[PDB]
Design a protein around this ligand. Sequence first.
Ligand SMILES: [Mg+2]
Ligand SMILES: [Mg+2]
Length: 327
Amino acid sequence: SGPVPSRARVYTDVNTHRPREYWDYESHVVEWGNQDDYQLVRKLGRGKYSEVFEAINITNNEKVVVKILKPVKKKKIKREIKILENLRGGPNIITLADIVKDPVSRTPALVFEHVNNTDFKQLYQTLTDYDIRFYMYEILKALDYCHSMGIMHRDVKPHNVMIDHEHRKLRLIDWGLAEFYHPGQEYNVRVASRYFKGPELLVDYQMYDYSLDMWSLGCMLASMIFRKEPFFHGHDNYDQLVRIAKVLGTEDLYDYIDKYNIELDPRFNDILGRHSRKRWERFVHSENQHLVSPEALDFLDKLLRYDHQSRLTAREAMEHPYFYTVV
Ligand SMILES: [Mg+2]
Ligand SMILES: [Mg+2]
C-alpha cells in the first residue's frame, strides 16, 4: 500500500485558503531594478549560488547586503524571491530590500538588510544559559511566523542564523531551499544540510511538513547546551541516521518506520545495528552543565523525536518552561 500519509498538526490548510498568486511562485513576475544605487564595500561570504557583499545604497546611505547571483534555474530564483516577499516584515525574517541587476553585465542580485554577524564558531562558546534561551526564542518567533505563512524553511542551521550579538538581533536567512506547505504533497527529501537533516529525510519519507524545521532546531539546541557542534556528526546521509540511532535508539526508529510503512533502503539494516537510547543526562559534563537544566532537557527531548508528528510545533515550543525566564 506504500507509505502512510501524514499532515502537519498546525497551519495545515493555510495555503489551501489563499489564492494561487500567493503560492504559485512559478507564475510570479520578477522585475529587476538598477544595481547602480549600490556601491559594493567588501565581500562577506560565498553562498551555494551567490557571492555576498556588504554595500551602501548611494541614494540614502543605507548599509545593505548584495547577494550577486550565479546562474540558476528561473524556477529556483522565483521561489526564493516569492517566499522572501511573502515573509517580508515578519519577526526575525531577513528583509529583502530590493531586486536589482548590473546594467552592463546583466548579473542579477538580491539586496537585503545587513546584519553584523558573529560567526557561530566564535559566538556559541561565549553564550550564557540565558543567551541560548533568548536566541532560541528568537528563532522560534521566525519559525512560527513562517510556518503560519505556509512556508517550511528546510535549511535551519547555525550558518543560516545571523546574530548581531551587541544588539541582541537575530535574522533567519538563506531561503533558497524553502517551500510552500500543501498537505498531501510528497516532497524531495534532498533538502537541509547533512548534520541537520531530520530522520524523515534520511529514510526517504516524502510527506513531511514544518516539523522538519523543528528537528533541525533541536540539533542546534543540543549543540549549544552540550557544547558539541554539530551534535550528530555523520560521514554521509546513511551514517547520519546511524549517529541519530546511537542516541535515540534503534527500537523507536524501527517503530517509526513500521508506523508509516516506510520502505527502508537495504544498506541500513547492516549499518544501523542495535542501540539502546542514550539518556540526555549522559551528555552533561563539567564544561556544559551551566547551560543545562531539567527544562532544557525536557524541551530538547520533545524536539529530537523520530516521529515528526510528535515533535513540538514552534508555537508549542514557545510555551515551554525553558522560556519562562525569557523577558
Ligand atoms: Mg544555501
Ligand atoms: Mg547561508
